[PDB]
Design an enzyme around this catalytic site. Structure first.
Site, PDB file in Angstrom:
ATOM      1  N   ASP A  84       1.928  13.721  14.687  1.00 21.22           N
ATOM      2  CA  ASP A  84       2.011  13.616  13.232  1.00 21.22           C
ATOM      3  C   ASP A  84       0.618  13.743  12.629  1.00 21.22           C
ATOM      4  O   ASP A  84       0.248  13.007  11.715  1.00 21.22           O
ATOM      5  CB  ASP A  84       2.682  12.297  12.830  1.00 21.22           C
ATOM      6  CG  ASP A  84       3.257  12.321  11.394  1.00 21.22           C
ATOM      7  OD1 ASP A  84       3.423  13.410  10.792  1.00 21.22           O
ATOM      8  OD2 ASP A  84       3.559  11.224  10.871  1.00 21.22           O
ATOM      9  N   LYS A 100      10.156   5.443   5.523  1.00 22.72           N
ATOM     10  CA  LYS A 100      11.579   5.268   5.768  1.00 22.72           C
ATOM     11  C   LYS A 100      11.772   4.150   6.782  1.00 22.72           C
ATOM     12  O   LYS A 100      12.829   3.520   6.870  1.00 22.72           O
ATOM     13  CB  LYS A 100      12.171   6.575   6.295  1.00 22.72           C
ATOM     14  CG  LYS A 100      13.570   6.899   5.833  1.00 22.72           C
ATOM     15  CD  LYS A 100      14.162   7.986   6.718  1.00 22.72           C
ATOM     16  CE  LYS A 100      15.248   8.763   6.004  1.00 22.72           C
ATOM     17  NZ  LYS A 100      15.881   9.764   6.906  1.00 22.72           N
ATOM     18  N   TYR A 101      10.707   3.919   7.538  1.00 24.41           N
ATOM     19  CA  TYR A 101      10.707   3.087   8.733  1.00 24.41           C
ATOM     20  C   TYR A 101       9.909   1.796   8.559  1.00 24.41           C
ATOM     21  O   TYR A 101      10.060   0.850   9.332  1.00 24.41           O
ATOM     22  CB  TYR A 101      10.127   3.879   9.912  1.00 24.41           C
ATOM     23  CG  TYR A 101       8.670   4.325   9.741  1.00 24.41           C
ATOM     24  CD1 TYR A 101       7.797   4.336  10.825  1.00 24.41           C
ATOM     25  CD2 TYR A 101       8.175   4.749   8.506  1.00 24.41           C
ATOM     26  CE1 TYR A 101       6.479   4.742  10.680  1.00 24.41           C
ATOM     27  CE2 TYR A 101       6.871   5.155   8.352  1.00 24.41           C
ATOM     28  CZ  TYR A 101       6.023   5.153   9.439  1.00 24.41           C
ATOM     29  OH  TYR A 101       4.718   5.562   9.280  1.00 24.41           O
ATOM     30  N   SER A 102       9.049   1.766   7.549  1.00 29.64           N
ATOM     31  CA  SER A 102       8.080   0.691   7.425  1.00 29.64           C
ATOM     32  C   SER A 102       7.573   0.513   6.006  1.00 29.64           C
ATOM     33  O   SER A 102       7.635   1.422   5.180  1.00 29.64           O
ATOM     34  CB  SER A 102       6.887   0.958   8.339  1.00 29.64           C
ATOM     35  OG  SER A 102       6.107   2.024   7.811  1.00 29.64           O
ATOM     36  N   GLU A 103       7.062  -0.676   5.738  1.00 28.23           N
ATOM     37  CA  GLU A 103       6.292  -0.916   4.542  1.00 28.23           C
ATOM     38  C   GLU A 103       4.943  -1.450   4.954  1.00 28.23           C
ATOM     39  O   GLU A 103       4.831  -2.270   5.862  1.00 28.23           O
ATOM     40  CB  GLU A 103       6.994  -1.889   3.614  1.00 28.23           C
ATOM     41  CG  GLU A 103       8.314  -1.363   3.085  1.00 28.23           C
ATOM     42  CD  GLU A 103       8.860  -2.218   1.971  1.00 28.23           C
ATOM     43  OE1 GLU A 103       8.371  -3.358   1.822  1.00 28.23           O
ATOM     44  OE2 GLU A 103       9.766  -1.751   1.245  1.00 28.23           O
ATOM     45  N   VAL A 104       3.921  -0.978   4.270  1.00 28.33           N
ATOM     46  CA  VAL A 104       2.559  -1.265   4.640  1.00 28.33           C
ATOM     47  C   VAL A 104       1.839  -2.024   3.542  1.00 28.33           C
ATOM     48  O   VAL A 104       1.899  -1.649   2.373  1.00 28.33           O
ATOM     49  CB  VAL A 104       1.808   0.035   4.942  1.00 28.33           C
ATOM     50  CG1 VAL A 104       0.325  -0.171   4.786  1.00 28.33           C
ATOM     51  CG2 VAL A 104       2.176   0.537   6.334  1.00 28.33           C
ATOM     52  N   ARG A 143       5.162   2.707   1.536  1.00 29.80           N
ATOM     53  CA  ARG A 143       6.329   2.497   2.370  1.00 29.80           C
ATOM     54  C   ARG A 143       6.871   3.809   2.875  1.00 29.80           C
ATOM     55  O   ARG A 143       6.911   4.805   2.153  1.00 29.80           O
ATOM     56  CB  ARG A 143       7.418   1.739   1.610  1.00 29.80           C
ATOM     57  CG  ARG A 143       7.582   2.137   0.152  1.00 29.80           C
ATOM     58  CD  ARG A 143       8.552   3.291  -0.031  1.00 29.80           C
ATOM     59  NE  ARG A 143       8.931   3.436  -1.432  1.00 29.80           N
ATOM     60  CZ  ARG A 143      10.037   2.922  -1.958  1.00 29.80           C
ATOM     61  NH1 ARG A 143      10.880   2.237  -1.194  1.00 29.80           N
ATOM     62  NH2 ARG A 143      10.301   3.096  -3.245  1.00 29.80           N
ATOM     63  N   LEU A 201       0.836  -1.206   0.000  1.00 27.02           N
ATOM     64  CA  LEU A 201       0.000   0.000   0.000  1.00 27.02           C
ATOM     65  C   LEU A 201       0.862   1.243   0.000  1.00 27.02           C
ATOM     66  O   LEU A 201       0.486   2.280  -0.554  1.00 27.02           O
ATOM     67  CB  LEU A 201      -0.941   0.021   1.213  1.00 27.02           C
ATOM     68  CG  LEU A 201      -2.122  -0.951   1.216  1.00 27.02           C
ATOM     69  CD1 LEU A 201      -2.853  -0.939   2.574  1.00 27.02           C
ATOM     70  CD2 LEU A 201      -3.089  -0.626   0.093  1.00 27.02           C
TER      71      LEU A 201
HETATM   72  O1  LIG Z   1       0.800   3.264  12.908  1.00 26.62           O
HETATM   73  C1  LIG Z   1       0.017   3.092  11.738  1.00 26.62           C
HETATM   74  C2  LIG Z   1       0.533   3.203  10.478  1.00 26.62           C
HETATM   75  C3  LIG Z   1      -0.339   3.010   9.353  1.00 26.62           C
HETATM   76  C4  LIG Z   1       0.136   3.122   8.012  1.00 26.62           C
HETATM   77  C5  LIG Z   1      -1.009   2.517   7.196  1.00 26.62           C
HETATM   78  O2  LIG Z   1      -0.770   1.152   7.070  1.00 26.62           O
HETATM   79  C6  LIG Z   1      -1.292   3.218   5.869  1.00 26.62           C
HETATM   80  O3  LIG Z   1      -2.602   2.869   5.267  1.00 26.62           O
HETATM   81  C7  LIG Z   1      -3.701   2.238   6.201  1.00 26.62           C
HETATM   82  C8  LIG Z   1      -3.461   2.117   7.612  1.00 26.62           C
HETATM   83  C9  LIG Z   1      -4.401   1.563   8.497  1.00 26.62           C
HETATM   84  C10 LIG Z   1      -5.626   1.103   7.976  1.00 26.62           C
HETATM   85  C11 LIG Z   1      -5.877   1.226   6.571  1.00 26.62           C
HETATM   86  O4  LIG Z   1      -7.083   0.768   6.047  1.00 26.62           O
HETATM   87  C12 LIG Z   1      -4.924   1.786   5.695  1.00 26.62           C
HETATM   88  O5  LIG Z   1      -5.218   1.872   4.323  1.00 26.62           O
HETATM   89  C13 LIG Z   1      -2.188   2.614   8.081  1.00 26.62           C
HETATM   90  C14 LIG Z   1      -1.577   2.737   9.553  1.00 26.62           C
HETATM   91  C15 LIG Z   1      -2.114   2.626  10.853  1.00 26.62           C
HETATM   92  C16 LIG Z   1      -1.281   2.835  11.910  1.00 26.62           C
HETATM   93  O6  LIG Z   1      -1.788   2.736  13.202  1.00 26.62           O
END
Ligand SMILES: O=C1C=C2C[C@]3(O)COc4c(ccc(O)c4O)C3=C2C=C1O
Length: 331
Positions: free
Chosen positions: A155, A48-52, A46, A44
């Protein structure tokens, strides 16, 4: 000679009167779920710290989101985990559903509830006056909750506010910069996205608090009702404070600096220049006027204040008449 100290004017001691285990995340023992419950489907994004990733929980076939944490300080990982657990169940706080680990490699991952979000670059163009009020109220619920629980998000920005618009569903995400508030603590000012950084951060005032999140929220509000995203658009951190001064004026900025005995970089004097405070009405035009009301401008004006101690708290903000119609229709 040194800067004047400051403390939060609300929720000052919420970690002080809680048991050590609440805020000492270094000592927290993680209860690991099973990595093999989840299948990754697509990347979905990335940092600097993570990839999602979007993922599926194969035990119930539910969508989730998995954030694999890069080889960073374990301390930072434990802080985010403790904060997410502490805040779980709170209004509009993203639910941490699981914490897993590759059992052979070290690598930890956080598993979150899935939000079918509409991208803010597209969504904000379509929101009505009432939608903005409604969603701002929902963000305020989350911020009042996490502040009341002793945590600063640090943030707040549109990308960290996930909105499933068809379900009128909002979740505040990315707690990776969040921190426990302890009165008198000097915090790192390298937090928040450039466009949402408060004046305290830009002038390197370290003894800040929950009110930082309220500035960021003010910045979001402005971008929404004025259809200008981001509202303060600097090309670096110095220029960011200049963009702010061109709207809020330099006189109130120098009063702020003076009151906290803050030492400004020499650089700043020449570039800050001298600017009158502008009326908010100056940013109202044919194309955004249907989103702007007297209540909106009065509300916005009480969020975007240089002096962090003079900004509305989340609870004060929720009491503002801007939200009358939202509160009325939520009872
Ligand atoms: O600390 C984090 C970091 C993310 C990055 C990220 O993964 C981006 O995109 C997301 C999401 C959560 C639900 C979702 O549906 C979605 O699209 C995100 C987060 C939730 C968190 O608590």
């Amino acid at each position: 000679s040194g800067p004047v100290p400051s403390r939060a004017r609300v929720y000052t001691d919420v970690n002080t009167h809680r048991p050590r285990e609440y805020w000492d995340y270094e000592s927290h023992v993680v209860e690991w779920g099973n990595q093999d419950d989840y299948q990754l489907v697509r990347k979905l994004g990335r940092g600097k710290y993570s990839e999602v990733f979007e993922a599926i929980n194969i035990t119930n076939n539910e969508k989730v989101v998995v954030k694999i944490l890069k080889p960073v300080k374990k301390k930072k990982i434990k802080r985010e985990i403790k904060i997410l657990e502490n805040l779980r169940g709170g209004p509009n706080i993203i639910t941490l559903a699981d914490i897993v680990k590759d059992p052979v490699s070290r690598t930890p991952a956080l598993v979150f509830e899935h939000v079918n979000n509409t991208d803010f670059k597209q969504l904000y163009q379509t929101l009505t006056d009432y939608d903005i009020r409604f969603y701002m109220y929902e963000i305020l619920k989350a911020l009042d909750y996490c502040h009341s629980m002793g945590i600063m998000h640090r943030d707040v920005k549109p990308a960290n506010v996930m909105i499933d618009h068809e379900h009128r569903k909002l979740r505040l995400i990315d707690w990776g910069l969040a921190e426990f508030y302890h009165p008198g603590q000097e915090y790192n000012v390298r937090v928040a996205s450039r466009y949402f950084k408060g004046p305290e951060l830009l002038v390197d005032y370290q003894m800040y608090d929950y009110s930082l999140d309220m500035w960021s929220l003010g910045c979001m509000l402005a971008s929404m009702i004025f259809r200008k995203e981001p509202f303060f658009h600097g090309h670096d951190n110095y220029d960011q404070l200049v963009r702010i001064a061109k709207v809020l004026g330099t006189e109130d900025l120098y009063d702020y600096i003076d009151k906290y005995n803050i030492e400004l970089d020499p650089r700043f004097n020449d570039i800050l220049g001298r600017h009158s405070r502008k009326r908010w009405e100056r940013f109202v035009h044919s194309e955004n006027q249907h989103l702007v009301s007297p209540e909106a401008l009065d509300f916005l004006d009480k969020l975007l204040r240089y002096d962090h101690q003079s900004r509305l708290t989340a609870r004060e903000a929720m009491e503002h008449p801007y939200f009358y119609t939202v509160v009325k229709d939520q009872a």
